[PDB]
Structure formats: structure tokens, C-alpha cells
Symmetry: C3
């Protein structure tokens, strides 16, 4: 799958190596091999969540066909909130997690 | 709903507080509460809209299952152009609005 | 159609004019007019693709309805891999391609 973290924390305030810890974190949370787990982090963005530009993070999780059941997604979101709140020092109320399906994806070679 | 604005204008040239005003414009145009409208703005990007790398903006709108009809999507667009032309100092022919659905989302 | 390229490469290592050349190649490869092709490059990101922090690039392709058949998507991918390895000086194993459908899109008059 694919994890995209957008945050309005600057880069110098986003921990180093987050991209790989996050990567390992997802694999064990989702029941994916970490060789299938692809992570993009984009910091220093301008964001408003609930009409507030206080520090916040948005995590998009994309997969082929179906990303998960409504029940499996809530349960997985819980573990994602536990992890990012510790990693970023944000309140859980400042973390969003969206899901969308993809049509396909190919790695080269 | 989620609104992602991608632009090749640097941050110095994007008005302070766009994300906030953008957020209240979206609630009233889409008719959704302001607590459910989430806004990301990503500037300093390299962009080519219709072969041209002149200043441009892409606004992606997303929501659960469906976003809108053909008609509601074009109506909603006309409103976003009037807001974004003024706020970014851009022509309407340099603004692109894409709609794509979500499986779900949750805030904490 | 829309093309989104995320890379951990800093902008000084992304060739100048890449966003123009990529629009022209998209048109020929996907078989679409160049007025209708839309490119975004976001460099200087923190990525981990197939569990590695080494230089990489994921490209996201997205048209309305269905981007393509598996067959045409496979063939198109192979052409994109040919293009981005020579432009970005990465190997195919560090380039990923995603396909997801859109509902609607509109350019201002």
C-alpha cells in the first residue's frame, strides 16, 4: 500500500527517519510486507483542520481495489493515531486518516 | 470534504490565511459544516498546465463515495474560480479543479 | 489526464524543464492531446519506496472513469519507466507508477 503524510509542522520539527519507522509501523498494523509499503512525507505545508491552522497531520492510505472494511479501517486508524501522536507530539484531535482505492500500481525491474 | 491546492507560486506569493478563508469559502459553496472541511496548500511546486509552466493552481476535491453530479461539480467550480482568481492573482484559464471520491476518513 | 511525481531528490538534482518534457511524453504514450495533460512535480520530500530511503520517484496518473485496461496500463508503464530513469538518473526498481480514476475535472475559460 501507499502512505502519504501531509503536515504543517516544518521539516526541522518533523523527526528524522519518520518515513522508515512509519513504513515498519504500517506493515505490522495492516498485515502487509514492508517491501509493499510505500511512504511519502510532505512537510512545511499550510493546512486547516476543523477551521484551525494549529499544527496538524493528514495521513492518506491508498491500496488496489478495496483498502479495507469499515471495521478493519477504524481498528487500523486507532494504531495509526497511537503512533503519530507519539512521533509528532500532536494531539490525536489534530491527526486525520483518509482511505481511497487505486486501479493498479507497478514497481519497475 | 478535503481540498488540496497545488501551485507553482512560491510561499512568499500566497496570501497568509488562504487555508482558513479557503476553508470557509468551501463550507458555504459545497454546503457542508466548516468543522468537516479540511484544507492543504502545497506551494513551490514545478507545474505544467496545458503545456505552459506559467503560474497555475490545481484544486483537488474529495469526499466519501461520490463528490457531486456533473452539474453540481461545474456549478461548484464556477464559485471556486471567482475566489481563487482574486486570492492568487491568477487567470481562470490557469485554474484546474479535479473531484475524486474516498472510501472513508476519521479525525481523532 | 493528470500526472503527479513525488521524489526525495532535491530540486537541484531534478533537471530543469522536466515538467514540460513529461507533459509531451504523457501525450504520446497515453494517446491524449497535450492541452488535456496536467503535470505536478513535488521534490525534496521524505520517501521510503519498497522499504528504502535511497533516491526514488512515484508517479501518479489519474483520468476520469477508468485510466485504462490492465494491458494498456502495463504497456504505458513500460514507456514511463524508459523516460524517468534517463531524466532522473535512477534505476527502474526505484520508480513506482499508480493509477486511480477521477469523477470530474474542469479548466477555467
Amino acid at each position: 500500500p501507499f502512505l502519504e503524510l501531509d503536515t504543517n509542522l516544518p521539516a526541522n520539527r518533523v523527526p528524522a527517519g519518520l518515513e522508515k519507522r512509519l513504513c515498519a509501523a504500517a506493515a505490522s498494523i495492516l498485515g502487509k510486507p514492508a517491501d509493499r509499503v510505500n511512504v511519502t512525507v510532505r512537510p512545511g505545508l499550510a493546512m486547516a483542520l476543523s477551521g484551525s491552522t494549529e499544527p496538524c497531520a493528514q495521513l492518506s492510505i491508498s491500496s488496489i481495489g478495496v483498502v479495507g472494511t469499515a471495521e478493519d479501517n477504524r481498528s487500523h486508524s486507532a494504531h495509526f493515531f497511537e503512533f503519530l501522536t507519539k512521533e509528532l507530539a500532536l494531539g490525536q484531535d489534530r491527526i486525520l486518516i483518509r482511505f481511497f482505492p487505486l486501479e493498479s500500481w507497478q514497481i519497475g525491474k
